[PDB]
Each structure stands twice: as C-alpha cells, then as structure tokens.
C-alpha cells in the first residue's frame, strides 16, 4: 500500500519556516526503513538532510521511525528493538558530528503497549536508551472506522488509557529509570479519526481527560494528532477554521500551569465526574503566584455542583465553561465559552477568553456532558511558589 516518495529542500524550508514563524519547536522523523544488506539502518539519506539543515542553520530535533512495531505489516520488514536501539546509536553519532551536536533525539514512537510492542520497547531501551532524550509512544482510544458517539462519552473507554500509561512506565522503570516519557502521537481514534465525532465538542471529553491523566501520571509532553491535515481529529479544518478541540487546547494553555497537583471526588463513584488540579499558569496576566486551576469533566446526564475544600471554600473563583453551540449538541463543530461563541476576531487575531466570576462561597455548577476550568484566586498555595 505505502510507496516511497521524495521531498525537496523547498519542502524542508516550508516546514521549518512554519514552525519558526509560529514559535513551535520542530521534531523531524527520519526514515528508519532505509536498510543495508544485513538490516542495519542506512544513514546515508539522513546524512544528506542533516548537512542541508546544518547549512541553513536550522535548530531541529530528531526522531527515527514511526510505529516500528508495525514495519512487518507496513513494509514486510521486521526490525527488532535491539537493532533499532543500535540504529538510534548510529543517528546519535551523526548528530554529535553535526553543527548542532547538542540536538535532541526522541524515540522509538512505538504504539500502545500490547505484548509485542512492550517487548520491542524494552529491548529498544536496553540497546538504545542511553542516547534518547525522551521515550515516545502513541495512544488512541478507538478505531475511527467503528467508533460510536457512546464510546466518546463512556468513562470505561476513558479509563483504558490509565492501564496503557502504567504499562509503559513498567517498561521504562525496568530499563531507563527516570527517562522522560512523552506521547509522541495521540488522538481519539486512529485511521484519521471518527467521522462526525473526532472534530466535534464530543471529542473534548477524551482530549481533556487524556491531558489530565497524562499530567497526573507523569507524562511530560503530549503531541496531538493532528494540528492540520487529512483526518477529522485535526484541531484546524480544511478552511483553516478552529474546531472545538483547538479552543479547548488554547484555554488549557492559558489557564493550566506546569506544576501538577491532585483532585478527587469524595464517595465511591468516581467514573463520570473527572477532576484535575494544577497550579495556575504564571504567564496568565490576570492571576498571581499561589492560584489554582481546577478542570472538570461531567459525563453524568444532570448538572453536578462541586464544593471546594477548606481553605478554598470562600475564594473568588473564575469559571471557564465550554458548551456546544446548537443545534447539533455534542456533535457541534462550534463551542461557547460562558455562553459566548468562540470565533477568530480576524485572520490575525484570536479573541479574548473571557472568565465568568462566580459568587464567593457558591458551589461550582457543571452542566451535564460539559467540561470547565475554574481558577481559584488568592489560593496562596505555597507549592505553586
């Protein structure tokens, strides 16, 4: 099915310019199926690219291969984790001899940890773990061909991610204890996403829950498939218009800080009301050192009312509640923040993301099938410096 294609210096420049002009840090995946006689990685093509990027003074990080667990299916070539580890050592040596000798190297971009994938990751980290800066793996909840609306709202589907994360950390703790663990490619559903679902307000339950659990469980970076492209899990559609998950992503970035804390709901039933707690993002000009950001998902079919614990019960709280714009409900491609539709001001201008201050001492209302952020002002949490 998959055939070789070439790309140009032009294509590299297009990609680099887009990252550089957008304030993003580019990670470039190198082709791992370029193989010598005895199935060693043939680095000669990568050398041409490193030389070109070096000549243009491009600051780029590297990967080698995508989902090497499925090379036998995709290309009728089997590469074991030991050999891939050796291939990464060969790439690390090329980077060290290049103009950016301190460039970062991530891998191996394995799929989620089924038996055979866990084995490949373990043998890869034993062999090649010393030269990677982070361990990358991938996760999807569903097959986009068969995913249902009910699946997108099902806490039993959301919870499966917890076991994937625990299984990856079991492999990494056994081989390279303390190595950073990244999600290198992740979405609701694979095969380009679930039609009429992966591009809707309903996609946000999975995305916000994945971010919450990733942060809580020790994942340092989550790479969303995809910013833009062929697949309705895109954040930005074919018209360059943002979908609900773009707005959720932007709100997350504005409100949620780097220091991860913990929230939980008193009582046995913890499935359908999902809660996460971080320090507030210090870059947010409205808030101050010590403030908290709570985010919550309500998969119940009724409004829930959250009560904050002492000593936060009487604090000024800012609500940032996301609900779909009708008439298509959770299958809407439009979202409102505190009852205002989120839309570009123009092609150059994002809108303000306007808070709704709540009455101090009021319980936090979370409607059925919704998600919200809540900033606790003057929380004065010492851990948040």
């Amino acid at each position: 099915k998959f055939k070789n294609s070439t790309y140009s210096r032009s294509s590299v420049d297009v990609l680099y310019t887009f990252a550089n002009c957008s304030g993003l840090d580019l990670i470039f995946g190198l082709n791992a199926l370029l193989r010598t006689a005895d199935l060693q990685w043939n680095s000669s093509n990568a050398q041409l690219l490193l030389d070109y990027c070096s000549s243009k003074g491009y600051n780029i990080s590297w990967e080698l291969g995508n989902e090497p667990n499925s090379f036998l299916k995709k290309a009728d070539i089997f590469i074991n984790g030991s050999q891939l580890g050796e291939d990464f050592i060969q790439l690390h040596k090329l980077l060290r001899k290049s103009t950016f000798k301190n460039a970062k190297l991530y891998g191996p971009d394995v799929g989620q940890p089924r038996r055979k994938t866990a084995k490949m990751l373990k043998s890869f980290l034993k062999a090649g773990g010393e030269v990677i800066d982070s361990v990358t793996w991938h996760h999807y909840y569903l097959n986009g061909r068969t995913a249902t609306r009910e699946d997108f709202l099902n806490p039993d589907v959301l919870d499966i991610f917890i076991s994937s994360v625990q299984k990856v950390f079991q492999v990494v703790e056994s081989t390279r204890p303390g190595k950073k663990v990244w999600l290198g490619e992740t979405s609701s559903a694979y095969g380009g996403g679930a039609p009429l679902l992966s591009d809707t307000f309903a996609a946000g339950f999975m995305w916000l829950d994945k971010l919450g659990l990733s942060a809580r469980m020790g994942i340092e970076v989550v790479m969303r498939q995809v910013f833009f492209g062929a697949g309705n899990y895109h954040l930005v559609d074919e018209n360059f218009d943002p979908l609900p998950d773009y707005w959720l992503s932007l709100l997350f970035k504005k409100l949620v800080g780097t220091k991860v804390l913990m929230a939980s709901v008193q009582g046995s039933k913890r499935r359908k009301l999902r809660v996460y707690l971080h320090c507030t993002n210090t870059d947010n000009p409205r808030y101050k050192e010590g403030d908290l950001t709570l985010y919550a998902i309500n998969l119940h079919n009724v409004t829930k009312y959250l009560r904050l614990p002492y000593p936060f019960s009487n604090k000024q709280v800012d609500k940032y509640l996301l609900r779909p714009l009708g008439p298509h409900g959770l299958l809407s491609k439009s979202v409102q923040l505190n009852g205002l539709t989120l839309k570009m001001v123009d092609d150059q201008t994002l809108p303000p993301l306007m808070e709704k201050p709540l009455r101090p001492g009021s319980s936090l209302g979370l409607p059925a099938f919704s998600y919200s952020f809540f900033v606790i002002r003057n929380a004065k949490v010492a851990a948040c410096i």
Binding site: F2, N4, S5, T6, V14, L15, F18, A19, C21, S22, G23, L24, D25, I27, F28, G29, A32, L33, N45, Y52, S61, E63, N66, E67, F71, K74, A75, D109, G184, E185, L211, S214, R216, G218, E220, V221, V222, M223, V226, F227, G229, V236, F240, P242, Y246, S249, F252, K253, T258, L261, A263, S264, V265, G267, L277, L306, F312, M344, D347, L350
Partner: protein, 74 residues
C-alpha cells in the same frame, strides 16, 4: 441533591510538565500534498499555530518511513 465534595492535594507538586506539555503534530503525509507550500504558508493557519506556542511540532507519521530526501528536487 447532585452536590459533590472535592478533596485537593496541595502540599507539593506531584509532577512538573513541560511548558510545551500540550504539543501538536503535522503528519508526514501532508508533505505529499501538492499544496504543502500554500497550506503551511497560510497566515490564518500560522495565527492559530502561534496561539499554541510554546509547543513541539512533530513532523511524522506512517509516511515517515516512506519519505526520501532528494537534494536535487525543485
């Protein structure tokens, strides 16, 4: 009455995520689109991308392992 009490742990950070915690991909596949230059040159798309800075941008996908650099191609 649909009221729920939260417990918070606030003693110390349990983890520290990257400032780039929420990152994004562009699929390797997109470089096989004849309009790759027009698409990534879009001012509107770049405005939305800047909105998510700081972030990593992973250029990668199934096609990562089917793409060959040709320094002579135009």
């Amino acid at each position: 009455q649909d009221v729920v009490d939260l417990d918070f742990f606030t003693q110390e950070p349990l983890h520290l995520v990257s400032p780039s915690f929420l990152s994004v991909t562009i699929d390797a596949n997109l470089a096989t689109d004849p309009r790759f230059l027009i698409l990534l040159g879009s001012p509107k798309l770049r405005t939305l991308a800047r909105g998510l800075s700081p972030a990593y941008l992973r250029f990668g996908g199934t096609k990562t392992d089917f793409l060959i650099f040709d320094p002579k191609k135009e």
